[PDB]
Amino acid sequence: DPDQLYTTLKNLLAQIKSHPSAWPFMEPVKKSEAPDYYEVIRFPIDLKTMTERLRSRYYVTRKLFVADLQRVIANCREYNPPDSEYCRCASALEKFFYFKLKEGGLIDK
């Protein structure tokens, strides 16, 4: 059901982008912030790119969406110190989006 999938993902992403811990991940990492980021992290992803992918019908499966979302967090944990503000935000956002994924029946409760 592509129409159910699209609206469900749109509604989920709107909530994720509204969370206070989403701020580090709203737009792509800039080279000024981390000059080697795009050599280290080979599949960079952020919530603006995910919005763009959603709206162009890239997410033809739930799993494609969940893979990008989980990679926002995984990239952050690979690049940044494990005890850092970005990693704290990643963990907070992760906790929230798993609650929402469960609420939406998009993973097992």
Ligand X SMILES: CN1C[C@H](Nc2cnn(C)c(=O)c2Br)C[C@H](c2ccccc2)C1
Contact between 45 and ligand X per CB under 6 A: no
Contact between 40 and ligand X per CB under 6 A: no
How far CA 79 is from CA of 44, 51, 86, in Å, comes to: 11, 23, 10
The single residue among 2, 7, 14, 27 that binds ligand X, judged by CB under 6 A, is: 27
Query: Could you say which residues in the range 59-88 bind ligand X, by CB under 6 A?
Result: 76, 79-80, 86
Token pair listed for 37: 């980021």
How far CA 1 is from CA of 6, 56, 89, 102, in Å, comes to: 9, 17, 33, 19
Summarize as ranges the residues that interact with ligand X (CB under 6 A). Answer: 23-25, 27, 29-30, 33-34, 37, 76, 79-80, 86
